Amino acid sequence: ESIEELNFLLHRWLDQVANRKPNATTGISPQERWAEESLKPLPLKDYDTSYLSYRKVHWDGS
Amino acid sequence: NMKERIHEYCHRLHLPVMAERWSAMAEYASTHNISYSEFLFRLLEAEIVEKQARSIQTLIKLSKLPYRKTIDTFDFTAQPSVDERRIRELLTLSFIDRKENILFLGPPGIGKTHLAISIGMEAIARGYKTYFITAHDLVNQLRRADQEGKLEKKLRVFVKPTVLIIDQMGYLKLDPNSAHYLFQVIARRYEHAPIILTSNKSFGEWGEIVGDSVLATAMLDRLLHHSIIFNLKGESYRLREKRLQEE
Amino acid sequence: NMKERIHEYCHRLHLPVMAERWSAMAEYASTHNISYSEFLFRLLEAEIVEKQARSIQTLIKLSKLPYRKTIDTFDFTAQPSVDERRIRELLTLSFIDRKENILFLGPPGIGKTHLAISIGMEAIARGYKTYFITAHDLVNQLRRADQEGKLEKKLRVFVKPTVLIIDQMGYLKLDPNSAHYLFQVIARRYEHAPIILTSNKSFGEWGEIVGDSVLATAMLDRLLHHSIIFNLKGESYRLREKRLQEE
Amino acid sequence: NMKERIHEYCHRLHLPVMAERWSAMAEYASTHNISYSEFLFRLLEAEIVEKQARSIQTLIKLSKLPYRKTIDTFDFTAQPSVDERRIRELLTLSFIDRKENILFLGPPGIGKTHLAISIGMEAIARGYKTYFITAHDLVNQLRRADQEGKLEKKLRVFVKPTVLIIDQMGYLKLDPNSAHYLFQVIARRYEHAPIILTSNKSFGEWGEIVGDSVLATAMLDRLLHHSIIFNLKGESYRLREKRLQEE
Amino acid sequence: NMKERIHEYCHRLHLPVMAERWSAMAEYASTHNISYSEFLFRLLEAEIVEKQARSIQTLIKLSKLPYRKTIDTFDFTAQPSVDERRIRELLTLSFIDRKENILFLGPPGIGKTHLAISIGMEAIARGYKTYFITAHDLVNQLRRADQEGKLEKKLRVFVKPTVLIIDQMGYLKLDPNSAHYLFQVIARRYEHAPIILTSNKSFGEWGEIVGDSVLATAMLDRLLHHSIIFNLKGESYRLREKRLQEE
Ligand SMILES: Nc1ncnc2c1ncn2[C@@H]1O[C@H](COP(=O)(O)OP(=O)(O)OP(=O)(O)O)[C@@H](O)[C@H]1O
Ligand SMILES: Nc1ncnc2c1ncn2[C@@H]1O[C@H](COP(=O)(O)OP(=O)(O)OP(=O)(O)O)[C@@H](O)[C@H]1O
Numbered sequence A: 001e002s003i004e005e006l007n008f009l010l011h012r013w014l015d016q017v018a019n020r021k022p023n024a025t026t027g028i029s030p031q032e033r034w035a036e037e038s039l040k041p042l043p044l045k046d047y048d049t050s051y052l053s054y055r056k057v058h059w060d061g062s
Numbered sequence B, C, D, E: 001n002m003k004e005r006i007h008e009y010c011h012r013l014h015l016p017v018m019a020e021r022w023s024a025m026a027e028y029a030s031t032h033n034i035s036y037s038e039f040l041f042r043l044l045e046a047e048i049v050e051k052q053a054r055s056i057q058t059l060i061k062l063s064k065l066p067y068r069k070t071i072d073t074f075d076f077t078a079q080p081s082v083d084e085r086r087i088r089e090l091l092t093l094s095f096i097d098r099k100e101n102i103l104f105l106g107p108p109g110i111g112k113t114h115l116a117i118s119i120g121m122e123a124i125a126r127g128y129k130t131y132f133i134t135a136h137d138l139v140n141q142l143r144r145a146d147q148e149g150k151l152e153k154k155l156r157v158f159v160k161p162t163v164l165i166i167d168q169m170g171y172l173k174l175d176p177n178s179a180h181y182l183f184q185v186i187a188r189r190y191e192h193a194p195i196i197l198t199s200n201k202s203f204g205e206w207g208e209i210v211g212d213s214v215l216a217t218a219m220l221d222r223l224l225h226h227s228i229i230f231n232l233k234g235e236s237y238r239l240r241e242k243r244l245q246e247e
């Protein structure tokens, strides 16, 4: 009934089975290969992805 | 009836928001005994606010900025060499009246274009027109216009905007013969409108970049007469700052 | 304050009438406690009425009509050749949808130009665009345009109007150049837009008028394919008015 | 012949007015040589006007309104408790779109029923459907319907109307059966259609009026969720008219 | 304006064809000086003709005929036993006034249903209602209605139509107890409306088909009192006629 609930269930399902079941070709649990991965470090501050609009305040202040 | 006629007349007079909210405003004025004059003022003020919002939207669209950024997403702790108060003062747009030119100079990735675009956004917010271009791109467009013979049109396009954001002055080097286009733009805007410049090459390299010493000297003599130059000393934010602060 | 801001918003939203009459209408509403919706409706209705008035004035100005005439000014007892029924049905402006061209033929001073001017005025009043040109002036302007190479511009200018009223036809003789100019004008506005023409010569005489029997016959055949003829007969109203002034 | 066939066709196409007035309008057109289009337009306009008149008469008949009253008949100087502005804004009939219920409260003879009848009359005039019922009669009819098992029929009949005017509320005391009948009526027309109610007792007294504090509180809470209150205070207009008649 | 208002009023008065053609009719009356009365008559007559066409369409739809056929596709050379003139006389629909019943009797495939449906189509053309049913089907529907208790509704459905086409009387045999439904229909329509019957079983087999001798005798006594019986002697057209004529 809520997208937050759906995302929570999806993440739990992934971490339970999807990223735990061994792959049919690599034949190994994805998390072990993840541990083998070497990704570049993240920046401290994330690229701000937020709608930016300019508005005007009414006479009263509303 | 009257409701449909009011809607039709509001649409024919180009008052969409007024057509949408006139019933609600009438009800509110009814429940508070608002004077007729204040009712009219409320409607007109709402319409004006919405129209100004759409105007700012159009101006930001035509600014041709690569993206949208603001001082809010800027950290002055990572750039302590230059004073924070001066940038805040610039945000008051007092330079637009003085016609002074704003120059950002520093190593690549130190936030030059970010600050320039932020100031341009502040200028666009208060109605002032702004045009963003890269110096080499501007010179190439002017050269093409001159070849086609209608150079004055593009020259007016570049000179009319109140704020001109010329970026990446040293990134690319076009044929030196085309530097006269850049000189034309800078001199025509001289003592008329501010120019926002951002680049990572010292003032001595201009003769090399444009392939002409005296031409660059004159360009700088005019661009630096009324200006406030900010020199940013540091290291590339994206890589160096994160690497040195994650320790 | 509020009144000055209301004036500024009215003149920034293109509301000329409201800028002045809003105070008077507020006074009127206060004297009768009119509802807010009705007050707004009155303001908008006055604005729309004045806007339409100004638009019609502009349309009449663009039409180049020598003077304003209306069917209400046209007496029909003095002109028993035709009947009010046909004239008023034409004034309904159905020929525009049917693309029927209207031709008036009669002796000088009968009134075949008054009816055309009235039709043009009504077409303007009903939102259509009308252009009134004399055949001689039309030919001269077309010849000049061809000389300067801008013939296409003037042809577009003369074809764009929904109703083209060509006056002073037949009295002046035409050369084959003018003949082909007239033929081109007719062809461009043939089955595309009505043509209102007033002449004093029968169709057969057009061969001598233009000096080309074949071209005149082609013009007549194309015109009569969608045409309405009006053979007006009677004593010249100019002469009768002069006689009445004498007595 | 033709006249009789015209009459037959008019009465076979449901054109009552044209059957009679067509001859008179033909006479009028002949006396002025009116255009065919205008003649047809006059016929159709007269037919439409009379059709709308008959439709409005039928709607008023169905409404069961005891008598026809209009705001134009309602003097406001004699009733200074409320202002013309609010009443006329209600007469604009925006509450129907907003589904706001209207409640009038005041001493006997103040005029809280005249305003309701005027609102119903205007709603009828603007194409809406109105049903005027007294609370006592409503309760009695609902009780009879429940006795006969046709309660659903009467509930549909009382909920279908766009505007339901419930009169004579508070003066007569109600039992819990009538209390639940009123609650059901309100619930069915809650956020679905406006209810216009006139009473003489404060909201708190409704608990004693219906004999159920909880049910009365529920009714009041649901009603006030979308409500407009009118506290009318003044000398009874019946008494003042009687005094004026005496003097 | 007026054209749009005329269109709207014609649509609101349910005069679609009038709305479509009023301009053309006005123009034609203009070009021929048709009187206003004749103009109105033309419009009304066209509307009446179109309405009658649509009415006939609806009547043929509700006739529930399996298909549409006419005397045009009928060859009287293949059926020389019976007179052609009598069928042509029937096409005058003089039997509808006399209330006489029309019976077609002959071997299968000899064209019974064709002629019956043709006569029914002629009746439908001139406005008379007509209902086509198969005798066994009619009896079964009446039995179901009687079981449900609302028999009178279906009885009225079967009795109201001016022309009833009962076909395939002998094709199927339902429970004899249901023959009273057929008797009810025939007796109720007796001396009120014609009945068109078509079947290939002699009058003596009715007692067997309905499983009752006296009931069938009474049915025939009533159905044959006022009637014109046509006995078709021949062979199945589709097979025998083609086989014998291709030789
Ligand atoms: N029926 C009429 N009623 C009133 N005024 C008329 C009538 N007919 C003509 N006039 C007058 O005629 C004068 C204009 O001349 P008119 O329209 O008769 O010329 P025309 O038809 O254009 O003739 P020409 O052949 O010279 O071009 C105006 O004063 C107009 O008032
Ligand atoms: N402001 C007014 N102007 C004119 N007539 C009025 C006014 N107020 C009341 N009346 C008169 O009141 C009479 C109807 O009674 P009224 O509408 O005052 O009763 P009510 O509000 O329904 O009271 P109650 O509590 O008895 O139901 C009508 O004659 C109407 O003319």
Ligand SMILES: Nc1ncnc2c1ncn2[C@@H]1O[C@H](COP(=O)(O)OP(=O)(O)O)[C@@H](O)[C@H]1O
Residues within 6 Å of the ligand: B073, B074, B075, B076, B078, B079, B107, B108, B109, B110, B111, B112, B113, B114, B237, B238
């Ligand atoms: N001081 C700072 N605060 C926040 N973000 C910064 C800062 N300096 C650089 N950035 C980030 O780096 C980018 C700006 O680099 P820029 O100044 O355009 O480099 P260049 O001038 O070489 O094009 C932006 O994405 C911005 O978010």
Ligand SMILES: Nc1ncnc2c1ncn2[C@@H]1O[C@H](COP(=O)(O)OP(=O)(O)O)[C@@H](O)[C@H]1O
Residues within 6 Å of the ligand: E073, E074, E075, E076, E078, E079, E107, E108, E109, E110, E111, E112, E113, E114, E237, E238
């Ligand atoms: N005399 C005829 N002329 C033309 N068509 C005929 C004739 N007789 C029969 N038909 C054809 O045969 C069919 C009618 O058979 P029908 O009378 O319905 O047989 P039944 O009465 O056994 O149902 C139709 O398709 C019709 O075209």
Ligand SMILES: [Mg+2]
Residues within 6 Å of the ligand: C112, C113, C167, C168, C198
């Ligand atoms: Mg003329």
Ligand SMILES: [Mg+2]
Residues within 6 Å of the ligand: D112, D113, D167, D168, D198
């Ligand atoms: Mg009352």
